[PDB]
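Exercise 7. Given the components listed, write out the predicted structure of the assembled complex. Treat all entries as one system.
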Amino acid sequence: PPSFAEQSTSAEILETGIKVVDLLAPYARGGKIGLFGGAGVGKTVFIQELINNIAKAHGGFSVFTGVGERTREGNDLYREMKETGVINLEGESKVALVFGQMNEPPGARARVALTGLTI
Amino acid sequence: PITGKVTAVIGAIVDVHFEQSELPAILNALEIKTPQGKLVLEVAQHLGENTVRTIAMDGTEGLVRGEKVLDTGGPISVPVGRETLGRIINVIGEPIDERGPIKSKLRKPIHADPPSFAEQSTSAEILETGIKVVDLLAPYARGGKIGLFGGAGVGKTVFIQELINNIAKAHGGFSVFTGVGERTREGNDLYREMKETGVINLEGESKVALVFGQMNEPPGARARVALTGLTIAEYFRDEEGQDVLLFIDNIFRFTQAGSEVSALLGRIPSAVGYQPTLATDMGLLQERITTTKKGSVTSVQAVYVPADDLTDPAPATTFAHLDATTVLSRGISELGIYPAVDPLDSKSRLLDAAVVGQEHYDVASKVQETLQTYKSLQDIIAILGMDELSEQDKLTVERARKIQRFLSQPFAVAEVFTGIPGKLVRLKDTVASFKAVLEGKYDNIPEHAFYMVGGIEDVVAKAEKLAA
Amino acid sequence: PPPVRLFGVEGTYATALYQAAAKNSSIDAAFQSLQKVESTVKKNPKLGHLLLNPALSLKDRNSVIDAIVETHKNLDGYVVNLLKVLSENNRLGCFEKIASDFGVLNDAHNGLLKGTVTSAEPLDPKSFKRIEKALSASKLVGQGKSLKLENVVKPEIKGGLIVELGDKTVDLSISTKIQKLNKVLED
Amino acid sequence: EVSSILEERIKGVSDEANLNETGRVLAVGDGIARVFGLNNIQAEELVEFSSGVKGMALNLEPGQVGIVLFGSDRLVKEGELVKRTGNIVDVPVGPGLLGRVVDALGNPIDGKGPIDAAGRSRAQVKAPGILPRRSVHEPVQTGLKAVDALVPIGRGQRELIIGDRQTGKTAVALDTILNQKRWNNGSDESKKLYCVYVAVGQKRSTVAQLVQTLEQHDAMKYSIIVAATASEAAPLQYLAPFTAASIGEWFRDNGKHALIVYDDLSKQAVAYRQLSLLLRRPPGREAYPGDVFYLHSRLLERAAKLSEKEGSGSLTALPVIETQGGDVSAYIPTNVISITDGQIFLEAELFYKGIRPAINVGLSVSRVGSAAQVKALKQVAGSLKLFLAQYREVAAFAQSDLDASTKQTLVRGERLTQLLKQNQYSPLATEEQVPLIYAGVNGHLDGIELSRIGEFESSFLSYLKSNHNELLTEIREKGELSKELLASLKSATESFVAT
Amino acid sequence: TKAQPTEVSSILEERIKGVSDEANLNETGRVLAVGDGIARVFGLNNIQAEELVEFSSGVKGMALNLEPGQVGIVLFGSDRLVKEGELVKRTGNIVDVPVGPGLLGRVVDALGNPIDGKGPIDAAGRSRAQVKAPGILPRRSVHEPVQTGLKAVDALVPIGRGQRELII
Amino acid sequence: VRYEASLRQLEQRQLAKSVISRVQSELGNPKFQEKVLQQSISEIEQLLSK
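Answer.
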């Protein structure tokens, strides 16, 4: 990881565009935003909305990396961002994908996250 | 003697391989000369092939595999004698009170077999305390273990001090306050307070001898501190005849310390997390304290229940040994009453009719009944209002609140601190006093004469002066 | 206790073997016989070195021993008991391991020390000799002991030399110096 | 310039000499290299690999000496010289460390050049004994109104800061550091507490924020921050409080005062678990290393208050423990609670309910108590403890037809509770703690409505500064409230309340 | 690799030396690693399973695990007594304790020692510590009172002769 | 002051990577051979000096 010297403080406010998020705990650019939540508490819906807002808004590229989530969810995400044009396979995509899904051997699931980090 | 080279230093468990001829017997003490002083290692296994495995009594950092080890020849031998009064002595048996080498006659192994079944004292008898609350409602048992309960801020330290003073007058015995798992702050306080209150008089002739084992000490040394202390006490009992009373600090922390030593030695952990050797180990500490036909050690130990559960294995194992419990409470001290002994929490084993005498029993039962009724009465006396009571009920309210005050007693150790003269009132004279209060022979005496007064005879005097 | 200890299983066998033959005071004899039985084992590669595979019986193992003591009748006798022991403990499979280990122990008793002069590539014989002379002369070789100095090729060590013997090393190499040098100019 | 410094550096490395002892890694896995060799190795001694990683040798096993790697696994690879550094773990200590962020080893990680230090002292040395220690007797004013009145903190006595996860526990601590600026700046050298903050297992970004915050309040100049961040290897994390204590020792021994705040010992524990389990040392309760009570006890008892014989130094300590879901029965919290000599129990509910700092008045205790607290502040806030106690008991009765007495308690209690809030990341001088608390205690602010309590507070301070900064200065310097001073104060409060 | 009880270097060296440890250790053992309140003795070849052995130092133990090459005594007594390389002699009996008429009014130790201190116990026999209980056909249902003399423990709760009856 | 310090840091890493380039040149030379002789005599001098 980049050394102690490298670190540089920041605080800019991302605009989520979601009422609960915006008022009561705004997210911040350059931060490490974290969508902690339960099992089937509507995690997917939340993530999907976030991708729609934040991804399109964001200027730079993004890498959407999936560590061990269902391949049903995977196909939906692939399809959804092909539709939303984020992944434009005629044009140039403004996102990359590193999908390692939970049918993969126990080892691969561990270092799939790392694969994404490097992109 | 035999010498051997350190052949492992994995954690605080240091294994020493001895140049074959004789292995130190299990429980013997080996001393490795170190540039820090000495490290006393105690052999707790023989690992075969002329190797032993030891636990450490000083920090194990900086041993070099190949250091010469020298075998003392038997369990750590701590100096003992009446030349050792008023000395803080560490686990390894050297003065840590920094008043120079302890002049001593004999030293004795810190592990010694409990007094034989033959030498058990056939009948049980009461050890006079001299605190009225103690001697009435939960009398201390001669050579029993009477477990103090309740944490600091109940005058725990002052209570402990009081006992040292009383015991010296009462019997002639010394004391040894042995502290296992004692905060370094608390130790400073204890030494300073004990000096101030004269139970240790450095210039003079001290009562209590101190063995202090701070939590700083290695896990092994925490385990052995209690046993080290016990040896000091036993020299007094066996060779000077006097009954003596040996305090232990948290005996929870004796158990806790033991739990670590087991885990380091590699034995499979046992129920709830405590030692696999939990029962017997508590047994070794708690059965050397017994009433011999020479003298008796008697031990007041402090039990700190873990997670406030009396069902946990560590308190449970402790509770088996205990004979009486004096349960100092902070509520009680907040009601002004000091000694802070809670009158309806303390309970004793010897407190059965044929043990304490029929008269003592009868007086006690009545005093218990009065106070017990008073508490329940106080519930509805408060709720309904004071006026709403029966003639019978207000007889009890009157009687009780007089008893409640009468429990108090200014005492000698804190004579300096409070100013008030101290009252050490004999066990027989305590019994007499409550008989009269029950019989209302002093129910004409104002209620503010019963607060902070000595025996019955004394509160006759106070009544007169108060009235004047 | 025999000088030079050997940690672990198979070398506990060697330790025992040495000290056992030390009290017989026939260690040279043992060593010679051990070399000989090891050699005729080694020089019988298929069937009797590649039939040290761990699968043979108790009875078949005993008969492997019987063939071994048939192969030559010159054996110390302590090492004939040792053959039995390894068979009996059915750890006969590690045979050469004990042999090598007895050798290490033995040549320590003989006095010989071993060193190493690892380098990037093989160095001059002139260098070998000069270093050997120096190293033997030095107090490090106590004398009453010998030095079998072995140059080994290790490409990872870039240039220089590293002297090793007695588990004490002097490492003056370019790779090691480069490591420290680089580090100091990254501060 | 930089060229000259490099030229100095190349010149500044010289040829080496023959290096006693060597090892060859027998197997290196799991960050636990086990090296065969190292004939004479002192226990816990620092050993340096061929690669350049440093390690210490926690297990000296009968045939192999089990080094623990202080860096990434990849660095060491099976069989490779393992040099013996020959000095048991020690870190530079000195007056010169003031103002540098240094890692566990002691290397400058702030990048403000070489750490100038006056000694290197070992990182495991045993705590001050029975006769060296003299009882606590000098207040340490943390500057948070709630801490300073409700739970006094004195010099040289450890007190826990045990509270719920990420309820800005660190904030409560950081506030203490800021207030020490007030005494620190001056010239009285029997007043300066030189704080050292030990950030163990916190992300490098968090520690960067810490560094910036301290610089912002102009507080780096009595701070040393030993930081072993989350990234850093599990041995470094393990040695991080122990190292830190040694940094503290220079202050304690040389007779200054200092406060070392170990944040958070909950993560210290996790690191010890990682080392022990990986070294295959026997597991124990709640899968925490067997001697875990012993480890925490060693660290926390190095704090002490030295006797006048021993130079009258101090080394206040304040461990921070993170209570997972507030379960104070958990093995790592329980051990620490026993070891410490006090607790401050920050409660999540209170935090949510806008009381920040969120000290739960009931469940905090100070065991050294009245030895601390400025004499002035003690006088006018004995009452404060008692009043709040009643407010707590009568709290649930706030759900009708209530006695006048009950209502009096409620009014006074609500106003006090509102009064004791302190705006985050700003300390408040002791000389203004005594006046503010005086008002609530004397019931002057009982009349003031809850919404205006906050406005009143700031107003009272400005009013005190304008009307009678003579009164304030007297309060500050005399440090004891004489009846005449309390008289003047009563008048001042009356005047203030009237406007 | 493994370990064995013959792994031990002292055992191993004697065998290598061609010395026969049989016909010495046929009926005596010499203790190997000991401590943890179980001791492991090498030899004792003719030991019965669950025999009582007496260690020469005056402590007796019951062989618990008879394992190929080692016999593992369990020390009925303090650890301090047995030090490694002590000579263990076979007592020759499965653990039995003296039983008889003349045990009346004598306190006895767990091994049947007279810890009452009234001198030797006069005892008819000794009988093995664990023995099988009377089977299905050697028994008949209870039919006599055990009069406890406490009303309820002798009225409400009836307790007769020859029956278990827990007090919890 | 801030940029001046930054520029010094920038200089330090720049001249550092240039040093790496000189190192790659040095290890090529038959100084790589000739300095082994220097090491050889140095070890002779060192180990005899103990």
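Discussion: Chain A is about 40% helix and 10% strand. The first helix of chain A runs from residue 19 to 24.
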